[PDB]
Amino acid sequence: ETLNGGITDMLTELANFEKNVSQAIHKYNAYRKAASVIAKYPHKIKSGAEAKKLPGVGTKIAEKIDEFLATGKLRKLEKIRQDDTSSSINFLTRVSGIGPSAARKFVDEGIKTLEDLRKNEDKLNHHQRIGLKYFGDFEKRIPREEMLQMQDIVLNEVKKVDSEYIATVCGSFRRGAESSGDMDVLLTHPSFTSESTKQPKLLHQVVEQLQKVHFITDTLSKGETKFMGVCQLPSKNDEKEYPHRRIDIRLIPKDQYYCGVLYFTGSDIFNKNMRAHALEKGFTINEYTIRPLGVTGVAGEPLPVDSEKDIFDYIQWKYREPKDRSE
DNA sequence: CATTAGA
DNA sequence: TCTAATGA
Ligand SMILES: [Mn+2]
Ligand SMILES: [Mn+2]
Ligand code: NA
Ligand code: NA
Numbered sequence: 001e002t003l004n005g006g007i008t009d010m011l012t013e014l015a016n017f018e019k020n021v022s023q024a025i026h027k028y029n030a031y032r033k034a035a036s037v038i039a040k041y042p043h044k045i046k047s048g049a050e051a052k053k054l055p056g057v058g059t060k061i062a063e064k065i066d067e068f069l070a071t072g073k074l075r076k077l078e079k080i081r082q083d084d085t086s087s088s089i090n091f092l093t094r095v096s097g098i099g100p101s102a103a104r105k106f107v108d109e110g111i112k113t114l115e116d117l118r119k120n121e122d123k124l125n126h127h128q129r130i131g132l133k134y135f136g137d138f139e140k141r142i143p144r145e146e147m148l149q150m151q152d153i154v155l156n157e158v159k160k161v162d163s164e165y166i167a168t169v170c171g172s173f174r175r176g177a178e179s180s181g182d183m184d185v186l187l188t189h190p191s192f193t194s195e196s197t198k199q200p201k202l203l204h205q206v207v208e209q210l211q212k213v214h215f216i217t218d219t220l221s222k223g224e225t226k227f228m229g230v231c232q233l234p235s236k237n238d239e240k241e242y243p244h245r246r247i248d249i250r251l252i253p254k255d256q257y258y259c260g261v262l263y264f265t266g267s268d269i270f271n272k273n274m275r276a277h278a279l280e281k282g283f284t285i286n287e288y289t290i291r292p293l294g295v296t297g298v299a300g301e302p303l304p305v306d307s308e309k310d311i312f313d314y315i316q317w318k319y320r321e322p323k324d325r326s327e
Numbered sequence: 328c329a330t331t332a333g334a
Numbered sequence: 335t336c337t338a339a340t341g342a
Contacts, residue, residue: 099339125333221331264342
């Protein structure tokens with residue numbers, strides 16, 4: 001956590017680089033189990049060899065470790081860090097919709113800068129166009145103060161359309177968060193569950209309304225169950241307009257709402273921990289259900305959930321408020 | 328790990 | 335159809 005820190009750190013620098021600038025999934029995969037491993041190690045690693053003893057760590061990485069130990073640096077990281085090509089690939093990648101592969105390609109063509117990307121808006125798909133469009137607005141955190149107004153709105157229109165819709169703004173906002181990166185609304189309806197062969201309109205009506213009133217101003221992708229876009233708060237009485245924000249809305253078979261909600265509410269760790277616990281408790285938990293366990297090794301048979309509680313109750317735990325699902 | 332865009 | 339990019 002702090003003992004092997006630089007180690008795992010330089011290791012991640014490395015991995016990350018293989019995978020993005022290079023297309024070496026393998027080495028990239030190497031650097032990672034290793035970092036995964038040197039991370040678990042309970043002692044200060046003093047040299048390659050000591051590390052080396054570890055599974056995943058070979059001679060190549062061990063060699064990195066010595067130089068890194070002997071000098072608080074590494075040439076390859078120093079070389080990479082300098083590499084404009086590589087820098088470039090790193091940066092483009094930030095644009096929403098630009099992945100490594102495309103990052104690679106643009107570079108090839110010679111588009112390294114934001115402005116490059118601009119003179120070439122033609123070569124970008126819609127997603128990336130939008131990503132290019134709100135580049136600044138997307139990199140900003142979402143002050144809670146705003147999350148509240150946004151949530152306020154989404155809720156209202158939702159209710160305005162069907163009275164029967166249930167919405168929940170999940171995420172860190174759900175958990176207290178002073179700010180968030182985007183907004184995740186999970187939604188469901190009574191007339192939509194595991195069986196009852198869809199009703200795409202469910203998602204659609206809603207998107208439509210939010211759009212109607214000008215909440216959503218752009219579409220990243222809209223399927224029949226996962227809508228992904230951009231919203232904005234009505235930029236009041238001038239002088240101050242609101243930054244463009246990412247928003248995701250996803251339909252959920254009401255019969256799996258709570259699990260889902262439970263899940264996306266997080267945090268990553270409270271989750272795992274809870275998950276690890278349901279296990280002992282003779283259970284199973286994933287983003288949609290909770291199945292009681294069985295001795296033959298495994299079992300199925302989805303228990304009925306009516307609220308975050310049922311789940312809690314199942315694994316016989318203390319209801320933990322969102323605020324405290326921190327870990 | 329599953330969902331959408333695109334080509 | 336597959337391959338990319340988001341997500342969480
Ligand atoms: Mn989120
Ligand atoms: Mn999101
Ligand atoms: Na080894
Ligand atoms: Na990106």
